[PDB]
Amino acid sequence: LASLMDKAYERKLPVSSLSISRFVDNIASREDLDSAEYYLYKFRHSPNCWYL
RNA sequence: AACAUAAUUAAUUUCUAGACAUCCGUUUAUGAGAGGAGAUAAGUCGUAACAAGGUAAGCAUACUGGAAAGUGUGCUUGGAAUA
Ligand SMILES: [K+]
Ligand SMILES: [K+]
Ligand SMILES: [K+]
Ligand SMILES: [Mg+2]
Ligand SMILES: [Mg+2]
Ligand SMILES: [Mg+2]
Ligand SMILES: [Mg+2]
Ligand SMILES: [Mg+2]
Structure with missing residues (x-):
């Protein structure tokens, strides 16, 4: 799961x-x-901080 | 080359990357050297034209000649024409 989130931030994509x-x-x-x-x-x- | 994330306020991201470099050509300037036209202006050689200019003149064309010009063939009068 750590890898998945890391890639999203590298590509500036929402998590x-x-x-x-x-x-x-x-x-x-x-x-x-x-x-x-x-x-x-x-x-x-x-971008999806509000959805915590 | 054009998708993928996301979604109980909603938004993110993609929405690209090479090659637009030479041109085929086209104008102008330069002019080895070879010509033309005009003017300068005392000359040289002839006297071709203007008089029936002393071989009437000229046109087209051909040949010939220091040079104007000469000769041929047809045509013109912008010549003459009674012995
Ligand atoms: K003559
Ligand atoms: K003469
Ligand atoms: K004459
Ligand atoms: Mg004569
Ligand atoms: Mg004579
Ligand atoms: Mg002649
Ligand atoms: Mg002769
Ligand atoms: Mg003769």
Whole structure:
């Protein structure tokens, strides 16, 4: 899932609310939170920020 | 080359990338050298035309000649024509 979102930002394409939802749901470790925090930041600064 | 994301306010992105470089030609300038026309203006050689200009003149054309010009053939009068 990380790769999918990264490609979208590289191509300046909108990311789905379902995509960010799947990431947060499947957090399984303390380290994963740090990555999700970065992707929550990226989602906020993206065209579909309102749809969180 | 023209799709793909997204969508419980709604929008994002694509909506391209080469090759428009030479031209085939076309004008003008330059002019080795070879000619023409005109004027300069004392000359040279002849006297072709104007008088029946001393072989009437001229036209087209041909040949010939230092040069005007000469000769032929048909045509014209812008000549003459009684012995
Ligand atoms: K004569
Ligand atoms: K004479
Ligand atoms: K005469
Ligand atoms: Mg005579
Ligand atoms: Mg004579
Ligand atoms: Mg003649
Ligand atoms: Mg003769
Ligand atoms: Mg003779």
